[PDB]
Amino acid sequence: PSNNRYDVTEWPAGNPAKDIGEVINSIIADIKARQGAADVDDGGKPGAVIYLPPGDYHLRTQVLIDISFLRIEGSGHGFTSSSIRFNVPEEEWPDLHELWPGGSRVIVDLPAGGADSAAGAAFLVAREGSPRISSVEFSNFCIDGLHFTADGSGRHPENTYANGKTGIHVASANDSFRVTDMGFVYLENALTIHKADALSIHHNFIAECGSCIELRGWGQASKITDNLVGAGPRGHSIYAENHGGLLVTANNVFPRGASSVHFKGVTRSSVTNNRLHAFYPGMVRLEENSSENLVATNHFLRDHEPWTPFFGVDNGLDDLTGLLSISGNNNSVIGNHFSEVVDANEIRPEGATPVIIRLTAGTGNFVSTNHVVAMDVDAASSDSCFEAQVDALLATEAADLAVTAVLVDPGSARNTILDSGSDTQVVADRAVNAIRATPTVG
C-alpha cells in the first residue's frame, strides 16, 4: 500500500504458512511496481517494511531482495536448543513443553546448495550496478534450518551441522546494511555477506549453525558487536577475509565452532573485549598476512567438551596450534586473559605442552601484558547438557599445568614480547626478538 507497510499474514492470495518466500517475493514485486520513479520531488524509492508476526512460516521459494531500504522484521528471535532436543531420546519427546523454535519463524524448506551455497539461502540479497544496494535491515525474527542431515561419518544426522541451508546471503557489494536482534538456528550457514561496507551485525543470537557469521570477498568499516554466537566443529563463528577497519567487540562466543574469530588477509581491524569459549585449539586465527590488528582485552577459555554426544568430536587441530595464532605483521596483542583447562592425558600430540599464543610468520608483532592461567582437570562427560556445561565452567579443582605462553616460530622475527609469560613460558630466539619476561615470585 501507499505507506509502504506490509504484513505477511495480511497479503492477498498469499499463505505464509505454506510458502512465506512467495509471499515476500510478491510484496517485493508490488513495491517495485509502485516505486518506479527515482527523482520525483527529491525522492521516490524510499523502500518499505515487511512485518512477520510471531508464527510458524514455511519458506519454499528463495526470497530475492534487490531494493535498497527494505526492512524485514518480526517480534521474536525465537531460539530453543534443537541440538539438545534431538539428543534427548525420542520416547521422551511427548513430555516436552515444546520441541521447535518459535517467534517470527521462517522454516527454510529448500533443497541443499551444491555444485554454490547461494541457492540454499532463505533470503538472497543481490543487485549489481550503481549505486551499491544500501541500508537493507533484518530485525528481530527467527530463521530455522529445521534438521541437520547425514554426511558419511558415524554421527547422528542431527549432529552433523550439514544441511546445505543459509539464513541470509548477500552476494553483491553493499553499504550500511543491518542485521539486528535475529535468531538463527540449525542452518549450515547462518549469515554470509560478501563485499560489505559499513555493515553492522549487532545483538543477534546465532547458534547451532555450522557457520555463524562470514564476511567474504572483501570489505571495510564494519562491525560485529554484542552477538551471542555458537557454531560447529567444521565451521566459523566469526570469519572475515580481506576486511579493513572491522570492529569485533562485545560478543559472547561459545562452542563449538572450529574457531571463534578467523581472519584471512584482514588488516587494520580490532578484535577486542570479547568473551571467547572453545573446546578446541585455534580459537583466534590471524592468517594469510593478517596485519596491523589489535587483539585486546578478550577473555579466552579453552577446555574439553563435557557433553557426551560431541565428546571426541573436534576441529582436527592439535594443542601446538595455539589459542591465538598469528601469521602476519605489525599486530598488537594486549591485555588478554587466557585460561587453558585441559586433561594432561587428552593433550595431542602425546606428551606435548600446549601453546597459547603462537607467531608462525610475519614481523613486528607486539605482544604485551597477557595473563596465561593453566590447569589440569580430568574430562568428564554426561548426557545432561546444560548441567554438564555449567558444572565444567564452574569447576576449579586442579593441579597446575605447564604451558608455552608464547611460541615464536623461526619464520617470524623482530617481534616484541612483554609480560606475557615467565622466561620459561616464552619460547623465542632472543637475538632477533625483544623479550621481557614476566617477573617471577623469587
Next chain:
Amino acid sequence: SNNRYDVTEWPAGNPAKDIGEVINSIIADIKARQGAADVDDGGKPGAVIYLPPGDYHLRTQVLIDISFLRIEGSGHGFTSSSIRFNVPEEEWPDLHELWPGGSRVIVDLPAGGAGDSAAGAAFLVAREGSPRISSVEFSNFCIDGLHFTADGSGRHPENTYANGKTGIHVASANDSFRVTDMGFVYLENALTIHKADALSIHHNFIAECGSCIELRGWGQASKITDNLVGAGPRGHSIYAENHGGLLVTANNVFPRGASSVHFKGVTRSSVTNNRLHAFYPGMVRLEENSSENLVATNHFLRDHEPWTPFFGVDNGLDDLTGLLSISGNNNSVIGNHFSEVVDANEIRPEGATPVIIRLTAGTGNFVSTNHVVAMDVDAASSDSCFEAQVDALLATEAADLAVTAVLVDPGSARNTILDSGSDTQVVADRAVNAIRATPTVG
C-alpha cells in the same frame, strides 16, 4: 490469531485498572490456541503483546510460563522520582510533570511477603520440566514501583529503596532471554534472573531501584551490555553468582549502589570497559572464590555524595576495603583507571591510608598497568541535585593524596603486580609475590 496483541484492544479486563489481569488473560488465550507441539513442524511459536504509551496499574502478578513470549512497549519513560519526592510537596503543582511515563506498568502489589520476594514481582517467569523456558523478550517499556516506604531506616520514606516490589523475576532455568531498552524506576528489585543461560541485558535504563540487575543461583554464557545503571546504598548495581563466561561491558554505572559490580563464585568471566562511579568503597567485589576473571580497561571514580538528602548515607564500608576487592585465584586486573576523590578528614577509619586494589585471599592474580590517581577535596553538600552532581564531577582543583594502590593481604600469595604503583604504594610481601614498581621519575 496472528499472535499479536494490544492490551488496549482486549475484551476482558481493563489495562488502566489491572494490566496484569489483561496480560494473564492473553497468555491463557495463547495457551488455548497453541495446544499442540508438533503440527507441520511447529505449533507453539509464541506471541507478542504490545503496550501503547499510557499509565497502566498492575494489581495481579503476571505469570509467564510459555517460551517465545515478547512484551514490548513504545517508551522507557524514566524521570527522577527521587528528585521529585525530595522537592517540597508545596512546589509539585509547579512541575511540568510528576511521574514516569512511556509504556508504564505501575506496580500496585503488596510487599514481597514471608513466603518469597517472587510474589512482589510484576512479571514472574516460571515453568518447570523440560525444555528450559526460552527466548522470552522484554523490550522498550517502563516498570515503576511508584513509592519507596518506611522500612525502619529513619530516612524519609521516599529515600529508603524499600518496597518489596520486583520488576521482572525469572525463577526457572532459562535460555536465550532478552531484556532490552527497558526503563525500571522505584523498585526495590528491578531485574532478578535465576539460572540464566545465554541471557542478554542490553541497553536498558535501570535507575533509582534498590537493586538493579541480579543474576542468581548460577548461569553461563550471558551478557550485560550497554546499560545505564543506578542502584541504592544497601543493594546491588550488577550482581552475579556462580556464573561462568559472563561478559559485563560498555555499561555506565552511576551511584548509589553498595557496589558497582558484585561477584560471588563467578569464574572465567569478564568485567571490562565499563564506566563506574560510586560514592562508597567496595565498587567492584570478586568474593567467594571468584576466579579467572578479566577486570580490564574500566574507569573507576569513587568520590563523596554531593546531594544533601543522601550526604550522610553510606554502604557501611571503610576506605581500607578497596575500590576493587578480590578473594579468589588467577584473575587478571589490567589497564584500569582509578580516580579516588575524597576529603582526607572524612576518611574512615580516622587517619587511614585509603586502599584501591585489595587482594584479600587467593593466589596467581595478575595486576598490571593500572593507573591510580588520588585527590583531597572539600566535601560539599547541596539540595540542587544535578547541579551539584555535575559540579563535583568537573572539579579537579585539589591536592595530591597518599594511597595504597595495591594491598596484598598475607592470606593472598603468589600474585604478580606490575606497573600499578610505586614500592610505597604497593604493600605486599615481596618474598612470595612478584612486584615490579611503576618506574620512578629519572
Next chain:
Amino acid sequence: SNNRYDVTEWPAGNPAKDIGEVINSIIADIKARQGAADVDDGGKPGAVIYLPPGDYHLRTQVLIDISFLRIEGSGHGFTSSSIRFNVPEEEWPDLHELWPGGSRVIVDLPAGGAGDSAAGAAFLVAREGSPRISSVEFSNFCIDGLHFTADGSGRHPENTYANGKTGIHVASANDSFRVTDMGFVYLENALTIHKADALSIHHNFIAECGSCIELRGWGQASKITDNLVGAGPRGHSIYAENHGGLLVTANNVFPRGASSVHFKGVTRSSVTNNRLHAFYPGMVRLEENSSENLVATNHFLRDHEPWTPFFGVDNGLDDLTGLLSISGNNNSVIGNHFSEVVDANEIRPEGATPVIIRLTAGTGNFVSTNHVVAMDVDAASSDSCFEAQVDALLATEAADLAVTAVLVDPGSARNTILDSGSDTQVVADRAVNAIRATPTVG
C-alpha cells in the same frame, strides 16, 4: 486515543509536503489530551509518533516540549549522497536510485541564522523550568539535509559540508534521552545535545554530515556506543564539552572529520574500544584541562584521502600535531594501536618527523603499552570512492617510516611513559618524566 499516531493517518496537512506541521499538530493534540499531572498516579505518559517508510519534506521546525515522546520509523535509509553528487549530473537518470530512503525526513528549512543554529534544526527539543525534560526517544528513521551549498571555499557546492541544517538540536537540560538506530545524512550538524544527563546515543548511522555528534554546555553519566560515524573536515565526529563520566566505546569512526573524538574540559570519562580512521592529524584531542580520562584499546589508523574530490582537502593541521593530543592532568592512555600510513613526500612541515602521541600540557598522565607502527606508502587517488577506500585500507606494500611515538612538550611534566616506543621514538625530558623505553633488539 491510546497515544499512538501514524503521520500518514493524520487528518490535517500533508506529511509528503510538510511533516513538521503534521508532527507539531500531533504534539498539540497530545498536550490537549494530557492536561493533568496527578490523576491516578499518572497523567502525562507521552506518546509515540510513527513514520512509515516514505519521503517526507519538512518545512516547519518541529518543537518537542513534553517528556516521554517517541518518534520512530522503519528505516535508517542511508545511501551515499556524497558519491552520487560526484557522479556527473547527466548520468543520474540511469542509477537505480539517487536519494536516501527508509523513513525519510527531508529538512527543507532555510539555512540557520548567524546568532543560532537551533533555528535550522528539523527537531528542536526545548522546555525550561522543572523537572528537566526526560526520556524523549528517536529511533530507526532517516534525517536528510538534501544538499550542501557554496560557501566561498571554491570546492564544488555538494562537497562543502555546509547548509546551516541540523537533524536534532536539544537546547535544554535533559535526562535519559535516547537516540537509536537512526540514519543522518547531508546535514551541517547531525545531532547537537546541550546539557545531557544519562544520554544514550546508540547504534546510529551518522555519516556525511559537517559535524555528527556534539555534546554541548555540560553533561554527565552519558554514553555514545556502537555508532558508525563519518563527518566533514571542518567539523567534529564526536565532540563533548564539560562532561564528566562520558563513556565512548565500540564506535567505528571513519573519515573525514577534523577529528574523531574531541574533548574540551571533559573529565573522568572513557574513550575506549573504538576503531578510529582519519585522513588528517589530530584524531583524538583532549583540550582545555581534559583530566582523569581513560583512552584505552582503541585502534587508530591515520592515512591519506584516496578519493579524488577530497584528495587535496585537509583539516589545517600538520604532522607534528599528533594523532592523540593531550592538554590536561592525570589521564590514562593504555593499550592503543596506532597505524601511521603516509607518504614521506606529503609530510608537513617538509622533512618533519610525524608525532603520534603529544602531551602539550598538564601533569601525571600515564601512557603505557601502546604499539606504534609506521609505514611509507603512496596511497594514490581514484575517482571511484569505495574502490579507492578498500585498496588503501588493505595495502601494506611499504618501506619503514621514522616517527615520534611520544612527544612530551616542556609545558607538561611528571608523566609516566612505558612500553610506548623506543628511546629514539620518545622525545621527552628523562629528568622530569618516568620513561621506560620499549625493549628493542637492535
